[PDB]
Design a protein around this nucleic acid. Structure first.
Length: 1288
RNA sequence: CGCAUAAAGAUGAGACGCGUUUUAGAGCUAGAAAUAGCAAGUUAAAAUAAGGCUAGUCCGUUAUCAACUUGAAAAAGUGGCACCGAGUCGGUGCUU
DNA sequence: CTAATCGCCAGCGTCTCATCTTTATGCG
DNA sequence: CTGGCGATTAG
């Protein structure tokens, strides 16, 4: 009673099928449990399983980072508040209390309404003196009077709360653009004795103030004083202001690469190196400062010290001026449009721009034609083109402001009010340290131990303020654990980390693996030490023949990092010592790990007695990358040593596995769960969900067949005009004059074949006459390997093009195509795939190795995820062992590729339509199963090609002519228009076993493919995610609003809406009826939100009690997650979607003649075969065109049975009776769009030919309380039916 | 089997700029009102999943999940077979 | 005086750094 | 995209 299992794996579906040896899916009757009266269900062993897609973890990461940033911002404000705390009580005691409770309503306040001053007249006087905060900041910077302390706190708090970016390192003082651009040429003339033409008027930074990222900046540098090299024209301007890329190789006349950069960390060390091995750099830095503050600062810096506040005040004043000017102009010209612009908040006028939800762009687009209609509005259009008309202060493009501007304003504020308050003098650097502090990206979250994501190690144990940060956290250990927690361990010893790529032990290992088993006569013995000492360790790159022959004549994979450490340390003494070897092995790890140059300075100040300061700086400026693959205890931790064996001609892997001394310890050290095994796979989680469900359904199917292992498990993992322009540019002839070069409407190959082959045949130099669609057809360059590529066909006029059965091109074609067509393939008119396929007949024809390449290109799959899931299934299924300790292969895992089964669909007319029902997953699984077991029955030894002896296919060519699956066809064709018959009953190579009895197996495949009942299961889930929609709605008198905090009532403050239901519960109880408090009983379905899910799983009874229910039955609480299945009268099925909405559950089983007729009518102009076959298909579809009325009757009876959507049904029928008089090919698309009315899942809105049908949603769960609840297993074969009418 | 280049994806850390919601920015004139006419408008405070206890300048949207019987959890265990047919599975026979 | 139905609605842009895998593409 | 919600209609 052997059997086999076929599996199709997708990202939203898993299809499974169980077949016997006769390719017949069996059936069986199963017991059902519960309290109903049915006791046995007959079911077929084929089906699918559908689920929601998996989600990546990026959105949770972004929200986690947002939470951390909000907590840290609140802590910054709290730090400033407690540093102002103990002295504010002299002026105002409850000032911070009024500043805290400013959100809530006057009836809930405990102080005055006006927060900043506590009364009315001072509030109005303050807001009249200062309209914004920027007037206050400019007054506090410029004026030298003793201000109030509350104003100083307000300015500092606004400066600390928003504090710019950190993308520019180094200090930055506000210096013009062209006023310093000539000073660069002044230093260039006083430092470089040449002729630098000071083009006063070239306007480098001024034209670079526009969109001049690279191209326009380089163009402005080119349209200037010409430079002899690119390093002077573009490169020097890059190293001064723009995106820098200099080099001290052919530009700075150096003997070593001393490459500077922009404002970064390594620029100061590179400038110290360039000055200590060989002003103008200050002028370049000032030019960089001018180019950086070009676009953001739009005001002179002479009259004031704070440029940002002056820019904002200027923007405020121009907004006021243009506002009153536009008011006067619209009062003059169009007085009837006043209210639509200045009063209507719903429109996109000025009132919508200020009080509504209008942005800048919608306001500009709304006000542009009204401003164009009037007159006298020229400069307003000038401003509107420049995006400087009625501009706000807190805009969406203030993100370019660096933090040094805010730091300078804060420093001037603290300097000006210094001598009036002494605690400002005592705590200046504390406040500046509050503003500029930023946690480094390798220290991570400052935790204590209760974190899934932290790696920080502490020295002491106290709170971490920004002032004692460097005193508490160890930075070197944190920077080491930041890297070492990510790099993988080696596969041999699974607990040890991996050496760096440029380690000395790894370099010795790779040079010994190169020159231990080296033969060119095999190499010597003890002379290999002298060989690696002289030739390898002296030459920077070991030669292939030259230096080896020189070393052989003198005596009788490079170590580049050894030479770098030799010339950096300027000797060769410690580079070969004993303890200095492991010391240098620590130094190379130090150089690989960190990238901060100061913790590096500490870790090499650990080793100060090996060099002076100069060698120390020369090696400290170095860097490396890359991590290797091996270990240290693998090579020099097992004792001889592996390096001792590799030094003195066996391979390293041959020393590891083949030798019994080494392979025992690694196999012992190889000594998780399933979820941990899938968790460290590769690829998207959307595939990993399907992989886990595949393992579960395989284990369940093994369980249901009486604990017998299967035989085979088959796995399938499912998944231009510029060329014509390039051909017209390379041709030069009339490629666009008469025949237009426009591949826009051209979708078929009838135009692309003329465009690729330049309007002539690949073999004949004749007129193609492309105006005829009944013209020259297409001919494949190599027929049955199946291929339909662009470079896999040819368009000759009318011939057989040669005389052959295994070769398409002829000798005259190869003689005539050698100059023109081969140059066209060399000029990329035709691709390289067509050139080799057209010229390969001139090299002996179809050789045996080419047939091997063809069958290995048609059979072998390449993806890694399929190999890994095959490995998982083979390790979980085959587990026994013999006395020699070998794997006892009781099952065979066979992987396929979808091209084979797609060819099997399109060959024998087993057509697939995705829009009808979800049966095609199970049908693809069944077809995969039968194709796999037939192919493993026919060609036995070729199991070594895919089932996971070599048996290389060079002396096997079983297969004779072209293809692997060419034995399925009962009448094989030929190349040059011929036929070749085939026997009926196939058999194996040596064994006697009929495999492919044609009539019986095809009748069985039709009978299985037309089976009405398969098992479709939608996987029930408990919903998780956000609590509700993230928008905040204004206040209403509704009851659906959720409070944003604990004591903020939503009828006064607003809140969120539309919460997400986790699951539902069925509650039977009694509630108050009428004003007499009558206890009328009720059976109700209630929805549980996620916050309520936690609070309800803590305690159910008190939760349902306080909700409003009394005297519940505690044992009758039934949990119902999403997609719970309910069966109703007449086989109507409904899936629960929420507490108050259902979804369609049933499925439509159309007969096979209808789906074949639909596939023929849909692609009526895209047959893509032989002309006789296309003519026969056209006669087959046009010979009877009344199936579609029967299909309409089919879906009418179905929708009257289970859908109950009669209004949309009558709309569909009226649309069909309207569009009766139509062609067939335009009617197949409408009748195939029609099938989403009766589909499975959520009700969608489709579209007919002209009209559009809306969706009938199912917003009522009153019927479900008198239904049959189904509890399904993972395959749907084990059920539990519960009659809810008998419950309670 | 190993190197070089490029692209894509996954995972984690650190930072910006907006947006949204309530309050504060005394609206004026005429009528008893309904209302009308007029003037103004750019900013700030606070919250940004309710909250949790291990009280940290932590943690809270990823992954996992039919029912029943055991188990604190982890995890383990629970369902007869052939044949003729097919509108969501039905019927016949043997043995329990 | 409650239930069906219709129509609208739904947080978003950027930057810095690190480690892996996989695919294509040459070269031995 | 698919469920929630207010304004509106229908029994």
């Amino acid at each position: 009673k052997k059997y086999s299992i076929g599996l199709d794996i997708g990202t939203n579906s898993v299809g499974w099928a169980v077949i016997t040896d006769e390719y017949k899916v069996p059936s069986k009757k199963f017991k059902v449990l519960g309290n109903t009266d049915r006791h046995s269900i007959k079911k077929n062993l084929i089906g699918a399983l559908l689920f929601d897609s998996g989600e990546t973890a990026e959105a949770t990461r972004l929200k986690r980072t947002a939470r951390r940033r909000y907590t840290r911002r609140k802590n910054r404000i709290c730090y400033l508040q407690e540093i102002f705390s103990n002295e504010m009580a002299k002026v105002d005691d409850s000032f911070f209390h009024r500043l805290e409770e400013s959100f809530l309503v006057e009836e809930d306040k405990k102080h005055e309404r006006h927060p900043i001053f506590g009364n009315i007249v001072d509030e109005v006087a303050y807001h009249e003196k200062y309209p914004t905060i920027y007037h206050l900041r400019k007054k506090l910077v410029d004026s030298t009077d003793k201000a109030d302390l509350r104003l100083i706190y307000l300015a500092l708090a606004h400066m600390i709360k928003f504090r710019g970016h950190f993308l520019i390192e180094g200090d930055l003082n506000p210096d013009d653009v062209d006023k310093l651009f000539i000073q660069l040429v002044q230093t260039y003339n006083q430092l470089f004795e040449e002729n630098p033409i000071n083009a006063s008027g070239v306007d480098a930074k001024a034209i670079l103030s526009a969109r001049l990222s690279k191209s326009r900046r380089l163009e402005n540098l080119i349209a200037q004083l010409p430079g002899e090299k690119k390093n002077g024209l573009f490169g020097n301007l890059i190293a001064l202001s723009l995106g820098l890329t200099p080099n001290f190789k052919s530009n700075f006349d150096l003997a070593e690469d001393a490459k500077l950069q922009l404002s970064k960390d390594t620029y100061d060390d590179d400038l110290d190196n360039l000055l200590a091995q060989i002003d103008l750099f200050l002028a370049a830095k000032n030019l960089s400062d001018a180019i950086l503050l070009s676009d953001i600062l739009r005001v002179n810096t002479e009259i004031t010290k704070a440029p940002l506040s002056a820019s904002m005040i200027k923007r405020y004043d121009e907004h006021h001026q243009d506002l009153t000017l536009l008011k006067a102009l619209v009062r003059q010209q169009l007085p009837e449009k006043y209210k639509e612009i200045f009063f209507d908040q719903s429109k996109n006028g000025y009132a919508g721009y200020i009080d509504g939800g209008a942005s800048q762009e919608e306001f500009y687009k709304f006000i542009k034609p009204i401003l164009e209609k009037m007159d006298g509005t020229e400069e307003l259009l000038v401003k509107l083109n420049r995006e400087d008309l009625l501009r706000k202060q807190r805009t969406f493009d203030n993100g370019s402001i660096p933090h040094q501007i805010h730091l300078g304003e804060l420093h001037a504020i603290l300097r000006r009010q210094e001598d009036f308050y002494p605690f400002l003098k005592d705590n200046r650097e504390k406040i500046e340290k509050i503003l500029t502090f930023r946690i480094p990206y390798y220290v991570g979250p400052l935790a204590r131990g209760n974190s899934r994501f932290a790696w920080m190690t502490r020295k002491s144990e106290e709170t971490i303020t920004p002032w004692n940060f460097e005193e508490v956290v160890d930075k070197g250990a944190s920077a080491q654990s930041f890297i070492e927690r990510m790099t993988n361990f080696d596969k041999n010893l699974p607990n040890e980390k991996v050496l760096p790529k440029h380690s000395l032990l790894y370099e010795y290992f790779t040079v010994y693996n190169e020159l231990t088993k080296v033969k060119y006569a095999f190499l010597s013995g003890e002379q290999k030490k002298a060989i690696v000492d002289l030739l390898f360790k002296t030459n920077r790159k070991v030669t292939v023949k030259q230096l080896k022959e020189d070393y052989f004549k003198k005596i009788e994979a490079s170590l580049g990092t050894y030479h770098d450490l030799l010339k950096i340390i300027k000797d060769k003494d410690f580079l070969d010592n004993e303890e200095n070897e492991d010391i240098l092995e620590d130094i190379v790890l130090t150089l690989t790990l960190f990238e901060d140059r100061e913790m590096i300075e500490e870790r090499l100040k650990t080793y100060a007695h090996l060099f002076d300061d100069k060698v120390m700086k020369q090696l400290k400026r170095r860097r490396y990358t890359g991590w290797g693959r091996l270990s240290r205890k693998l090579i020099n931790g097992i004792r001889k040593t592996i390096l001792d064996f590799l030094k003195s001609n066996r391979n390293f892997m041959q020393l590891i596995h083949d030798d019994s001394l080494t392979f025992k310890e690694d196999i012992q050290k190889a000594q998780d769960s399933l979820h941990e095994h899938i968790a460290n796979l590769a690829g998207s989680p959307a595939i990993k969900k399907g992989i886990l469900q595949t393992v579960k359904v395989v284990d369940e199917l093994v369980k249901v067949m009486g604990r017998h292992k299967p035989e085979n498990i088959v796995i399938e993992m499912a998944r231009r005009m510029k060329r014509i322009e390039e051909g017209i540019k390379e041709l030069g002839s009339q490629i666009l004059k008469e025949h237009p070069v426009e591949n826009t409407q051209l979708q078929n190959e009838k135009l692309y074949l003329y465009y690729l082959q330049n309007g002539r045949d690949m073999y004949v130099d004749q007129e193609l006459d492309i105006n005829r669609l009944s013209d020259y057809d297409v001919d494949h360059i190599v027929p049955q390997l199946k291929d339909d590529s662009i470079d896999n066909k040819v368009l000759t006029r009318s011939d057989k093009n040669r005389g052959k059965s295994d070769n398409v091109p002829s000798e005259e074609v190869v003689k005539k195509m050698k100059n023109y067509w081969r140059q066209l393939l060399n000029a990329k008119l035709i691709t390289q795939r067509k050139f080799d396929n057209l010229t390969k007949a001139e090299r002996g024809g179809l050789s045996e190795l080419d047939k091997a390449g063809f069958i290995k290109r048609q059979l072998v799959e390449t993806r890694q995820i399929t190999k890994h899931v095959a490995q998982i299934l083979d390790s979980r299924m085959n587990t026994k062992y013999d006395e020699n300790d070998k794997l006892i292969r009781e099952v065979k895992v066979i992987t396929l590729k979808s091209k084979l089964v797609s060819d099997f669909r399109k060959d024998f007319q087993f057509y697939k339509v995705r829009e009808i029902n979800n049966y095609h997953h199970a049908h693809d699984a069944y077809l995969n199963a039968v194709v796999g077991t037939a192919l493993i029955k026919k060609y036995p030894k070729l199991e070594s090609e895919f089932v996971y002896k070599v048996y290389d296919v060079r002396k096997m060519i079983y297969f004779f002519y072209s293809n692997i699956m060419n034995f399925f066809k009962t009448e094989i064709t030929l190349a040059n228009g011929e036929i070749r018959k085939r026997p009926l009953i196939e058999t194996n190579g040596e064994t006697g076993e009929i495999v492919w009895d044609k009539g019986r197996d095809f009748a069985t495949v039709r009978k299985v493919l037309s089976m009405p009942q398969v098992n479709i299961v939608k996987k029930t889930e408990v919903q998780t995610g956000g609590f509700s929609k993230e928008s905040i709605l204004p206040k209403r008198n509704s009851d659906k609003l959720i409070a944003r905090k604990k004591d903020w009532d939503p009828k006064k403050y607003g809140g969120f809406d539309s919460p997400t239901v986790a699951y539902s519960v069925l509650v039977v109880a009694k509630v108050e009826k009428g004003k007499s408090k009558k206890l009328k009983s009720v059976k109700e379905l209630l929805g549980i939100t996620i916050m309520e899910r936690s609070s309800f799983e803590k305690n159910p009874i008190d939760f349902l009690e306080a909700k409003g229910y009394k005297e519940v039955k505690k044992d009758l609480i039934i949990k119902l997650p999403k997609y719970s299945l309910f069966e109703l009268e007449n086989g109507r099925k409904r899936m629960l979607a929420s507490a108050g909405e259902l979804q369609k559950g049933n499925e439509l089983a159309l007969p096979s003649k209808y789906v074949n007729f639909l596939y023929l009518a849909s692609h009526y102009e895209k047959l893509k075969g032989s002309p006789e076959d296309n003519e026969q298909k056209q006669l087959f579809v046009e010979q009877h065109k009344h199936y579609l009325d029967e299909i309409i009757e089919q879906i009418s009876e179905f929708s009257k049975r289970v859908i109950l959507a009669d209004a949309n049904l009558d709309k569909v029928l009226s649309a069909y009776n309207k569009h009766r008089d139509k062609p067939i090919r335009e009617q197949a698309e409408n009748i195939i769009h029609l099938f989403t009315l009766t589909n499975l899942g959520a009700p969608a809105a489709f579209k007919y030919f002209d009209t559009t049908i809306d969706r009938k949603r199912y917003t009522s769960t009153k019927e479900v309380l008198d239904a049959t609840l189904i509890h399904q297993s993972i395959t749907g074969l084990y059920e539990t039916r519960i009659d809810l009418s008998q419950l309670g």
